[PDB]
Design a protein around this ligand. Structure first.
Ligand SMILES: CC(C)Oc1ccc(CNc2cccc3c(-c4ccc(C#N)nc4)ccnc23)cc1
Ligand SMILES: CC(C)Oc1ccc(CNc2cccc3c(-c4ccc(C#N)nc4)ccnc23)cc1
Lengths: 247, 238, 289, 39, 247, 289, 39, 49, 50, 39
């Protein structure tokens, strides 16, 4: 016989362990593989797909109305139109997105975000917007002269319907945490704001109000770490017909 | 140049002058079933141009209150032309689809349609424990309307539906969308009367608007099956 | 292009740009493509050699951890007068009962994997004598096999069914079930009806039926009663995954379907998935000093 | 360590680093360009 | 000593495990092998042997009478003679067959079936039959004009006593299940029907009624999966003299 | 021809046929051969490359799983006044007592294999004190050896008999018995009489006699009584099998014989093995829509 | 893994893929033909 | 039947080809318009949108 | 199976033992190392400072 | 002995005998001398 001794951790059930285990059905032959469209092998492939931000998360926006922002012609120059909180851990416009829902299974994240806005006014509508990213440290900017000091794209409406604002990874640490403390220096990303650069200008027979759809995705420099249970789902009771699986 | 497109299949052709490229779902193209993936051993019928052609469904009216529309494949085509006759006479079917969605308006109109092909779009019912019934699911050529497009009638979300193969129709930009669908199933063939591989969904995320005089703005759906195979010839279920 | 990716992409330095006809921040969402705008195109960058690994987001790692799929409590007692799980239970195998695993699996349309099963058993004295070291039998009863009707029915003789016999003082019992769909992948979602008639179940592919797990205490009852609780964990391994999906937002209602109601108010109400802020100009956690 | 006769008994396969996100991000028939406008 | 730890599944008795175990009789020498006729090594060799279908599973067919179908001369053209349900899981003509009894130890099956019919009328009897297989999806056909649209063999009686109808494997999935839900799309095979193609025609001194024996076997493309206890046998009590083995 | 078969046969494409004198669907059952008609001869086929493995129907896999062969309960108590298994039992070894294994084995005429034996023991308090960790002794007593008459008889000193000593808290005790027939194979059926006179037993080959399994508790009795149940499982391994047989249809009656009665009514009545339908034209589960 | 001295102690032999079903399906002295009638 | 779906745009015109689909090599200019040697079938225009 | 026996000291927790142990977070990637001033590798470097 | 897939699971690394105490004892820009006075 082989002399042995048992270590600490002998006989434990760790749910993340990786062993071989006894096959219950000997000589079983699985069904041959078939090619299926759309194999995914890394979840970073999913978060690179852009998906709609719920920017209009306001009362009296109902259902689909929460996925669009309405823009109107203004009579004052350089007005603020909207802002977007960037805290993916807290319940804001980014949470119910592809990048949002996958990232919330993880605790740490790094890398750049892409926001794309599609203008959905009429062909006859014209205008210029400025989209600004503000690295953290102070309050969200409320005036265009303050916001234009950050990273920004000036957007002219035209044949190409969409601009991207890249939100570059500007961080002291390698990672940020999905922290319920949104003001923590390990978690805060700063702000996105949109101002009128010129104005929304439309003719009489175009609709006077126009909508933006905003999208977000991760870039291919994006990385996630430390898997956790996602706070997006829970249960209190058993589901219906779950008891019946025992009857 | 990516704005003009002609699709020709059998005796049918579509031209568009205002496309926005087109989608090939998951980068795939339809193919016939190869011998190393076959199950059923009878020699399949391959009708080609009799089935592999555009069928145009009844157009729907885009109104300010529209929640969106859906059509299930193969169900929406199961009673149309020689495609329908072959599905009625055969136990097994396989095909791809080329979907072309059409909606023109004026340069004074605005609005955006999400055009998305959803694989295995298993519907939920709202506010009940009872599963959707047969007549809720099986709609044929008319298709259905969304109850709650914001959760895609399945408790998920519209915002994330861009993970599925899609284009947009943005009336500013384009008047048509095109999606090419491969065979999308866990089995190599299926019984076409009891399982739908694909749901076409058309959802007005930005509502139709103008201040010109109103006209009816229809949305029109043309679907061509691609590489139709049928196995298990018998009498028509019909 | 398909390529081997082990780390996040590096950043190259970029200069000033001023080229006519070149406009990399403009895009067309209507094609259905995602934006191809790079950071080097949007801002002036530095060179960054990026070492961050991508292994933790592998579909294998994302899914291959053990999750609770079944929990049952029954009385271990003399059942001659009970109405009840009489020293054994039968479970119709499903993955829809526990929402954390259910939501993870439902991020995908088709899944192919083998299942590692762990069985954890616990016992308490009914309202103390110490805890007995019971022997249990778990028997897999496939489709169309006969399930046991009694703790001591002859079905438990298990001539061809897989059974595992295990003690409460042992480590949890562990077996692997092979990938056993009659198709090449499980159908996580199924837009179809199970039967050739119209009355069959919606939403469940018949191809995915596993069978029944029947679990008994092997011991004769004792003079006093106990409650036994059995927990089954499933870990996918050797995983393939196809066609990722919008995640579940609304609370689940049922194990039979995708039926939805939502919470009374946001977050995850049918009308509002994200909680409300006062306006599109309101920054909810704004830094003020 | 695997002394079992069936290969499905094995430990998990965590070494598959192949990606192709373009099937989800760029299923367009004509590939996008950086140096040219999309439409 | 070797440092070790125990995994989950340590000390379990799995009835399908495959280990070496301690020999109770050391240095025992087994009896030399001898060649015996009829070695079987795969159970698929057994199911390839044809065996009689109990097609006449009707009341007032008693014993051996259930293994034959009687054919009479008809005065109406193209009449249905009999049908055969194909659900091997449910209690029909196929169940108590070699292919039937072996397959019921398994849960999944694939591949083609062969049916052979032997005509057992007199030498002077003549006739033509049509044997039809209908792939599933609708009702069993009741008229020859409907049945002849499926896979069929027209059978002329003659010197060769027997025809085979091949039932080809026509299935969407790689396998079918032995499902007690016979209408399940994972289990239903469809139907076999027999009609008069011409008529049974006999002279006055031949018997006016003649019998078919039907047989079934698996072909060599046939495959079985997922072993189970067969529902064909059970016990309630101990057997007689079983207690006496302890006395 | 004997050949190595690992997967089901492939299907070749076939054309139209119209040849005089060639008639592959016609057969002659009277030869005793099975039909040689191929699908490529009966219908037009496609080419199918068939990957389905045949390993699960190997006779080794079909038979080599552990089945219950013996179950005995006895009282562990002070037996000075009992009439009874007085802290030990003797079992005359047989395979005919439990129908699931019996029916599987009886699909064959001759079998040669080694037997893996597992002994599972369970204890309950007689009508609670906790469960004791008893030591048990199983002793193989071959033909013509003396069996123990008492729990503490000197037969248990086991100078030459194989004994295994095992605890209740241990895993089940496991040994292999070699193939031990005095012939090259066991006679699963025996159309003969055991003795040279006429009065000997029908139906049991004397060549197949194993012997007795004697099992005692080794401990002295406790002040209180317990019931001990012993379960013996047998797994054939290194199996050879010859001349397959019609399976058992009728319920078994006895361990001594193949005597038969059947159920009162179909299925598995003597007069009707398959359940009745209304007519040969009735389709019992007909699809109607 | 087998450290026992008797070879009958070993684990099961699941690798014997030889078949000859013709001894049960075709024990006829003159073998059947496909291209010719049986009788 | 054979059809072209026509989107109005910068290019002002579509062609519908009427292909020669005939059992015989020729058709006759027959005053019997319903004759199987003369009838060509029909062209129709519908609103697509 | 391998025949084994357990020695004295089996199952003890010695606080100075040196074994590998089961990783709780599979496929985790630690933060890349960075050069930091003042790495100490032996405590005898500290006591040499006055 | 390490059969775990992650290298952080390993036993401790007790073999790093590199020292440089001069970064703590002599961080002076001009190194000290034995044969000459410090100032
Ligand atoms: C008693 C012992 C010897 O056998 C046993 C023991 C336990 C079990 C319980 N298994 C199981 C429990 C729950 C789920 C599964 C699945 C499965 C999972 C996910 C999806 C999807 N999407 N689809 C199928 C496959 C195989 N098994 C499962 C079965 C047999
Ligand atoms: C106490 C320990 C050390 O020894 C033991 C332990 C347990 C046993 C019980 N064995 C056994 C129990 C039941 C059957 C057998 C057979 C057997 C099986 C099938 C056929 C057929 N067809 N024919 C023979 C062979 C050897 N053994 C058997 C015997 C000796």
């Amino acid at each position: 016989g082989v002399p042995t001794y048992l270590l600490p951790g002998s006989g434990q059930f760790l749910t993340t362990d990786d062993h071989s285990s006894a096959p219950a059905l000997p000589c079983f032959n699985p069904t041959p593989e078939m090619h299926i469209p759309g194999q995914v092998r890394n979840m970073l492939e999913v978060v690179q797909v852009e998906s709609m931000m719920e920017i209009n998360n306001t009362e009296s926006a109902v259902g689909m109305e929460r996925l669009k922002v309405d823009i109107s012609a203004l009579t004052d120059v350089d007005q603020l139109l909207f802002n977007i909180p960037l805290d993916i851990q807290l319940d804001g416009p980014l949470r119910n997105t592809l990048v949002g829902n996958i990232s919330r299974y993880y605790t740490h994240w790094s890398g750049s975000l892409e926001m794309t806005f599609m203008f959905c006014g009429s062909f006859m509508a014209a205008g210029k917007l400025i989209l600004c990213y503000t690295p953290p440290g102070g309050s969200c900017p409320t005036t265009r002269e303050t916001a234009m000091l950050g990273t920004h794209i000036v957007w002219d409406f035209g044949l190409q319907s969409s601009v991207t604002l890249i939100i570059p990874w500007i961080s002291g640490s390698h990672y940020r945490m999905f922290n319920n403390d949104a003001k923590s220096t390990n978690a805060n990303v700063g702000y996105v704001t949109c101002f009128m650069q010129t104005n929304l200008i439309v003719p009489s027979e175009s609709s006077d109000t126009c909508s933006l759809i905003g999208f977000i995705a991760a870039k291919d420099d994006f990385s996630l770490r430390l898997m956790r249970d996602s706070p997006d789902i829970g249960q209190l009771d058993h589901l219906h017909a779950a008891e019946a699986a025992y009857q | 140049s990516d704005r003009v497109l002609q699709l020709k299949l059998g005796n049918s052709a579509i031209v568009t002058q205002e496309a926005a490229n087109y989608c090939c779902a998951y980068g795939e193209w339809p193919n016939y079933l190869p011998d190393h993936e076959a199950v059923a051993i009878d020699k399949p019928t391959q009708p080609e141009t009799a089935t592999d052609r555009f069928y145009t469904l009844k157009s729907v009216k885009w109104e300010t209150g529209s929640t969106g529309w859906w059509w299930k494949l193969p169900d929406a085509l199961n009673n149309i032309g020689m495609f329908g006759q072959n599905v009625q006479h055969h136990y097994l079917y396989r095909s791809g689809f080329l979907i072309h969605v059409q909606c023109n308006a004026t340069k004074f109109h605005q609005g955006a349609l999400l055009v998305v092909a959803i694989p295995e779009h298993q519907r939920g019912a709202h506010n009940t424990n009872t599963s959707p019934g047969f007549d809720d699911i099986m709609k044929g050529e008319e298709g259905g309307t969304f109850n709650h497009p914001y959760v895609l009638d399945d408790g998920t979300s519209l915002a994330c539906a861009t993970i599925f193969p899609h284009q947009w129709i943005n009336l500013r930009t384009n008047n048509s969308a095109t999606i090419v669908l491969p065979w999308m199933n866990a089995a190599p063939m299926d019984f076409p009367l009891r399982h739908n591989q694909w749901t076409l969904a058309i959802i007005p995320v930005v509502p139709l608007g103008t201040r010109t005089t109103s006209s009816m703005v229809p949305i029109t759906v043309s679907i061509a099956p691609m590489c139709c195979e049928f196995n298990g010839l018998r009498h028509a279920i019909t | 292009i398909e390529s081997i990716i082990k780390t996040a992409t590096d950043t190259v330095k970029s200069e000033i740009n001023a080229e006519l006809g070149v406009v990399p921040s403009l895009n067309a969402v209507e094609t259905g493509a995602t934006s191809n705008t790079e950071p080097e195109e949007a801002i002036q960058t530095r060179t960054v050699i990026n070492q961050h690994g991508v292994s933790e987001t592998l579909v294998e790692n994302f899914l291959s951890r053990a999750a609770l799929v079944s929990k049952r409590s029954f009385e271990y007692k003399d059942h001659t007068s009970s109405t009840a799980d009489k020293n054994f239970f039968k479970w119709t195998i499903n993955t829809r009962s526990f929402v954390q695993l259910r939501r993870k699996l439902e991020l995908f349309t088709y899944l192919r994997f083998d299942a590692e099963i762990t069985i954890l058993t616990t016992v308490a004295v009914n309202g103390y004598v110490g805890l007995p070291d019971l022997t249990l039998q778990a028997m897999f009863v496939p489709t169309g096999a006969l399930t046991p009707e009694k703790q001591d029915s002859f079905h438990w003789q298990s001539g061809s069914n897989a059974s595992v016999f295990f003690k409460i003082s042992d480590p949890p019992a562990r077996i692997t079930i092979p990938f056993m769909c009659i198709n090449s992948a499980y159908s996580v979602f199924y837009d179809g009806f199970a039967g050739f008639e119209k009355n069959g179940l919606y939403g469940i592919n018949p191809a995915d039926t596993i069978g029944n797990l029947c679990v008994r205490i092997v011991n004769e009852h004792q003079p006093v009663g106990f409650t036994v609780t059995v927990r089954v964990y499933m870990k996918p391994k050797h995983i393939k995954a196809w066609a990722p999906r919008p995640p579940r937002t609304l609370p689940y209602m049922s194990i039979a379907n995708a039926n939805y109601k939502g919470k009374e108010r946001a977050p995850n109400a049918l009308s509002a998935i994200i909680g409300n802020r006062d306006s599109v100009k309101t920054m909810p956690h704004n830094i003020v000093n | 360590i695997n002394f079992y006769k069936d290969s499905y008994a094995a430990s998990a396969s965590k070494q598959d680093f192949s990606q192709d996100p373009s099937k989800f991000t760029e299923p367009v028939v004509e590939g996008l360009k950086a140096g040219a406008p999309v439409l």
